[PDB]
Ligand binder design. Structure first.
Ligand SMILES: [Mg+2]
Ligand SMILES: [Mg+2]
Ligand SMILES: [Mg+2]
Ligand SMILES: [Mg+2]
Ligand SMILES: [Mg+2]
Ligand SMILES: [Mg+2]
Ligand SMILES: [Mg+2]
Ligand SMILES: [Mg+2]
Ligand SMILES: [Mg+2]
Ligand SMILES: [Mg+2]
Ligand SMILES: [Mg+2]
Ligand SMILES: [Mg+2]
Ligand SMILES: [Mg+2]
Ligand SMILES: [Mg+2]
Ligand SMILES: [Mg+2]
Ligand SMILES: [Mg+2]
Ligand SMILES: [Mg+2]
Ligand SMILES: [Mg+2]
Ligand SMILES: [Mg+2]
Ligand SMILES: [Mg+2]
Ligand SMILES: [Mg+2]
Ligand SMILES: [Zn+2]
Lengths: 116, 122, 86, 58, 72, 137, 97, 49, 99, 23, 96
RNA sequence: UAACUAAGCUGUAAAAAGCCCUAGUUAAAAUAAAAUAACCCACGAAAGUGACUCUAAUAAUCCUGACACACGAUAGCUAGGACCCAAACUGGGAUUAGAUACCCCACUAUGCCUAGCCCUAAACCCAAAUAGUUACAUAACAAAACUAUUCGCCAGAGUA
RNA sequence: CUGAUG
């Protein structure tokens, strides 16, 4: 499992200059500590799309949509261990798994090297 | 400001209010939250007799503490404030300054719905 | 109960006039809708009957509003006909 | 003003669930309803009671 | 027409003109028509700015001796 | 002659008196106008019952006490016992929507009590207890 | 060939849309003086659109702010605060005829 | 501009040093949020009394 | 020859634009005991009530001043395919050709 | 109308449930 | 009306404007036809149900020496003519 | 659950039965439900959801598609807890020729929380999904008539 | 309130 540190300096305030000179109060408010789950979802999405993909700008690609659905599937599984009776989220997870499997089948039929 | 604590403290004297506010702010800081500002809304009459801690409260001092806190330490501060015998009714909400105001466009003229029935001669 | 007494639904009489103050209070409760709410909360109505009552009352309000609007629109032509006998 | 009518009735073009189920078609008729006569009630009760108050004591 | 875009500014600023409309006269020329007649020529005089085309016609209407009531 | 129908709350400094007493010291007449009976109880401002009279205690019967004349006479029967203890003004608090609602209020005036205000305190739950089922199945 | 033909342009006489009384404002839950202007002074009932005259957003915002303050402890539920009874009347309901 | 804006607000935050003075200044600086509206749509503030 | 679009571009009804709050001189052509049928000239005739002052000065043929509110009163109702035209115009009476 | 067929199936179902209760 | 779109010039702020080129082009043919039927000794009937100009239309038909109907049109006037008008009646050769 | 006052309270077209450890006023936890807003028409795949706050969160760079997978109103079942109020059943009282019904009273399963089942509805908006058109054209009524790709069904009625 | 059948 990935371990994003709470002081990750989230991407909305990561690519801006003059961020390391500011004090620890502003850095703590702009870090992943004071953030919700969506900011960690974005950080995990970029951390996976940087290392798994070869063209992080090509979002409409099949291998990009697969790695974009993988983080949603993992967040749904993280939600499911805490909410067992959540049938709507169980349905979202069981349908996102089928959509990722359909995209994996199309990627296996189109580009086997990227599929492997 | 991220979160807002609409604190209703028991109507007490000045040093007791100051010690209750000191310990409430210190408990807010122990959880890993920085405090932005503290606004005293004044001591008014309660709209209804609030029964808290085996006490019938008719008055109460209103305070507003805004602060940046992680999403995990809100419920713990709520359990901390639920057991305090100097708080009448604690409530932590999102700050209204977080949601940007939208363009209230105004009343759009909606016409009367037509073609709801066929053109049969009655 | 927990609120202060003698504030809500309270009107003061004027010059010993009680009959008219009771009509004023009844108009208060009727314009606020408490009379029909009290008469409706005597027996429990099922949600399907409540939905049917709301839909009937909404269609009836739509019809009454449009009929009153057409009456106020055609009120002009109520004058005497100037071309009688043509 | 008149209540809204868009998206209320059950039609083919209406994608959502119907809000209103009209008993009769919402067509404006060419005649208004006749004025209903008010149900009469017994009168002089508060005066008959004070008239009988004399008899009960005398 | 293009004259309506100036008639809207005239009816937004001054409202109805002082000379009431006479629909019976076929060749009746109103104050808004005089305003757009001044505007079409101030456009030909090489001016592009709308303020320089509007307030100058509003001042040129005083040359004929008419009154303009700016609705505040 | 600026007269407001709103009650004179104690939070203000208004100078309105009835027989020398303030609005808060004037006794209360709680009138529970049910669908089959109408009960009137005149209590002091300190919540001490002074007079009590209902349509049942006046020698009426099952369906007789549900009418409006029974409540009109109940107002007189309560106003007699209230005036006997030195009560000249009262604040009437009505409870419930019944046929003897206004009849008891006018019966207190017919029995010699001056009403200064009418408070409608009817129990209206914000969807709390579920009431009984409907009749005529 | 004709010059006096009408051109397909936008409507210049387009009157601006009417705004609600709180259009481009900030409805809050701490201004019970503002929230009390839309409740009945006798029973505390929240008025509807046909009485208030607010475009669809601010009616829901006012309802949510009133329901929030009434349970947070800022505004009474059964009646209107008499301190805010002398406020300017904005609603279109008339009780005393 | 967001980080430059939050930089200025970091100076007025409440810390362990400013706690005792901020509590005392808040207890002596009462704030009110109440403001009414009119039929024309203009804000009226009760601070004029 | 003159084209219809060229005469319509310079017709006064085109110069008036919207018929809301416009000062128009209209001539009375019919008289009812209390109603005056004034012809402002556009399409229809507006019916106004005879005022209290100078009421005797309003005779058939008298020209008066009007503030036009609507050129023709038409509205739609429940289950109508077309509008319900009133065959009349809406305008108020101000004076009688002040000069 | 359709209530005739609804009542026929209603009587069928009621008699079937009573038969099951008996046997 | 839906069948008025080809006969319209446009819409001047809600009010539809009828073009006059086609108006005159139709009026020329209408006047020619009515003049030819009036030349060939044809019965012409001016029909109009409008309670403002009924007197004007009666006076115009009287000055024209043709016939007029500005009143309530009966049911079987044109179809049931040999029973509504008379035993043997000549129907109008043109209706304006 | 306590204190003052009264002998009545509840109950219906009218009564009776029931409670008088009853009724009115003043204080009161727990449970259940969530007035007005709502003349609003939003969310969710459907069922369903409108007292308040907080956390997580509402698939698909978006065609159709099962007997496969996951859900599925009320009612019902099992184990534990709660029970203000309502209420199947039941027992009394009315009405009736009869009333194991409609009306009144009391009370039980149940409706409430946790976990596991059951997988049914007039689950209907009786109108399948996806992209469209207003051409030809009214069996009747109703929600106007139709295209192109599909899937699921329909072969007289009862039996069923 | 109630009140069956041909
Ligand atoms: Mg309570
Ligand atoms: Mg939907
Ligand atoms: Mg029907
Ligand atoms: Mg009908
Ligand atoms: Mg049934
Ligand atoms: Mg059978
Ligand atoms: Mg008995
Ligand atoms: Mg609620
Ligand atoms: Mg989606
Ligand atoms: Mg599919
Ligand atoms: Mg189920
Ligand atoms: Mg169950
Ligand atoms: Mg159990
Ligand atoms: Mg039970
Ligand atoms: Mg019960
Ligand atoms: Mg029985
Ligand atoms: Mg359903
Ligand atoms: Mg079906
Ligand atoms: Mg399908
Ligand atoms: Mg037919
Ligand atoms: Mg068969
Ligand atoms: Zn608005």
């Amino acid at each position: 499992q990935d371990d994003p540190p709470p002081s990750m300096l989230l991407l909305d305030y990561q690519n801006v200059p003059g961020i390391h000179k500011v004090d620890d109060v502003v850095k703590r408010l702009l870090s992943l500590e004071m953030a919700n789950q969506k900011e960690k979802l974005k950080i995990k999405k970029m951390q996976l799309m940087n290392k798994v993909l070869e063209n992080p700008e090509d979002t409409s690609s099949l291998e990009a949509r697969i790695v974009a659905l993988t983080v949603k599937i993992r967040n749904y599984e993280e939600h499911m261990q805490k909410h067992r009776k959540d049938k709507a989220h169980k349905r979202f997870l069981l349908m996102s798994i089928d959509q990722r499997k359909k995209m994996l089948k199309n990627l296996r039929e189109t580009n086997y090297a990227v599929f492997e | 400001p991220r979160y807002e604590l609409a604190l209703i403290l028991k109507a007490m004297q000045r040093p007791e209010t100051a010690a209750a506010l000191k310990r409430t702010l210190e408990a807010l800081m122990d959880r890993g939250a920085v405090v932005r500002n503290l606004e005293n809304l004044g001591e008014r009459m309660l709209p209804y007799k609030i029964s808290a801690h085996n006490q019938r409260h008719s008055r109460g001092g209103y305070f507003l503490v805004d602060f940046y806190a992680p999403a995990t330490t809100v419920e713990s501060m709520m359990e901390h404030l639920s057991r305090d015998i100097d708080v009448i009714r604690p409530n932590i909400v999102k700050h209204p300054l977080t949601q940007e105001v939208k363009e209230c466009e105004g009343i759009v003229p909606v016409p009367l719905e037509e073609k709801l029935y066929s053109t049969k001669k009655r | 109960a927990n609120h202060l007494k003698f504030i809500a639904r309270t009107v003061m009489v004027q010059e010993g006039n009680v009959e008219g103050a009771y009509r004023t209070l009844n108009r208060i409760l009727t314009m606020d809708g408490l009379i029909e709410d009290i008469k409706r909360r005597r027996y429990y109505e099922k949600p399907c009957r409540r939905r049917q009552r709301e839909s009937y009352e909404t269609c009836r309000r739509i019809y009454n509003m449009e009929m009153a609007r057409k009456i106020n629109f055609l009120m002009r032509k109520n004058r005497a006909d100037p071309w009688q006998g043509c | 003003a008149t209540p809204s009518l868009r998206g209320r009735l059950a039609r083919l073009g209406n994608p959502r669930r119907p809000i209103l189920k009209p008993n009769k078609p919402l067509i404006l008729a060419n005649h208004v309803g006749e004025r209903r006569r008010e149900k009469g009630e017994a009168t002089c009760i508060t005066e008959m009671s004070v008239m009988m108050a004399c008899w009960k004591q005398n | 027409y293009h004259e309506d875009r100036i008639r809207a500014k005239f009816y937004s600023a001054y409202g109805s003109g002082p000379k009431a409309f006479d629909l019976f006269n076929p060749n009746f020329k109103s104050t808004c028509q005089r305003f757009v007649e001044k505007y079409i020529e101030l456009q030909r005089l090489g001016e592009t700015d709308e303020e320089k085309l509007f307030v100058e016609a509003g001042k040129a209407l005083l040359a004929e001796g008419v009154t303009l009531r700016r609705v505040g | 002659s600026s007269f407001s129908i709103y009650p004179p709350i104690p939070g203000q400094e208004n100078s309105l008196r009835w027989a020398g007493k303030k609005f808060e010291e004037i006794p209360i007449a709680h009138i529970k106008a049910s669908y089959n009976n109408t009960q009137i109880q005149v209590v002091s401002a300190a919540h001490q019952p002074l007079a009590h009279a209902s349509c049942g205690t006046e020698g009426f019967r099952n369906a007789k006490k549900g009418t409006g004349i029974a409540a009109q006479t109940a107002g007189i029967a309560a106003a007699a016992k209230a005036t006997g203890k030195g009560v000249t003004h009262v604040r009437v608090v009505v409870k419930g929507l019944g046929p003897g609602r206004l009849s008891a209020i006018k019966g207190l005036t017919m029995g010699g009590l001056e009403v200064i205000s009418i408070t409608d305190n009817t129990p209206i739950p914000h969807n709390g207890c579920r009431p009984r089922k409907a009749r005529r199945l | 060939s004709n010059e006096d033909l009408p051109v397909p342009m936008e409507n210049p006489y387009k009157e601006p849309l009417k705004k609600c009384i709180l259009c481009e404002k900030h409805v809050d839950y701490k201004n019970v003086q503002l929230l009390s202007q839309f409740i009945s002074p006798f029973t505390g009932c929240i008025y509807g659109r046909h009485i208030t005259g607010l475009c669809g957003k601010k009616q829901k915002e006012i309802t949510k702010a009133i329901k929030r303050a009434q349970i947070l402890g800022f505004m009474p539920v059964t009646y209107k605060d008499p301190a805010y009874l002398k406020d300017p009347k904005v609603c279109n309901i008339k009780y005393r005829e | 501009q967001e980080v430059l804006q939050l930089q200025e607000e970091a100076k007025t935050f409440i810390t362990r040093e400013n706690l005792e003075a901020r509590v005392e200044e808040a207890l002596d600086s009462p704030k009110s949020y109440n403001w009414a509206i009119t039929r024309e749509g203009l804000v009226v503030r009760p601070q004029q009394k | 020859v003159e084209s219809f679009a060229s005469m319509l571009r310079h017709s006064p009804l085109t110069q008036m634009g919207p018929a809301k709050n416009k000062l128009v001189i209209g001539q009375i052509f019919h008289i009812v005991e209390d109603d005056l049928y004034i012809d402002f000239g556009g399409k229809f005739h507006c019916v106004c009530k005879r005022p209290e002052v100078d009421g005797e000065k309003y005779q058939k043929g008298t020209r008066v001043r009007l503030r036009l509110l609507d050129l023709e009163l038409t509205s739609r109702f429940l289950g109508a395919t077309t509008d319900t035209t009133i065959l009349e115009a809406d305008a108020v009476l101000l004076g009688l050709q002040e000069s | 109308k359709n209530i005739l067929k609804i009542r026929r199936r209603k009587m069928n179902h009621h008699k079937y449930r009573k038969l099951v209760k008996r046997t | 009306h839906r069948f008025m779109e080809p006969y319209l010039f446009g819409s001047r702020l809600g009010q539809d404007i009828i073009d006059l080129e086609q108006t005159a082009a139709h009026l020329q043919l209408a006047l020619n036809f009515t003049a030819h039927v009036a030349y060939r000794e044809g019965i012409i009937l001016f029909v109009s149900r409008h309670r403002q100009f009924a007197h004007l239309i009666e006076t115009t038909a009287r000055d024209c020496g043709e016939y007029a109907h500005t009143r309530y049109f009966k049911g079987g006037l044109l179809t049931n003519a040999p029973l509504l008008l008379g035993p043997g009646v000549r129907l109008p050769d043109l209706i304006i």
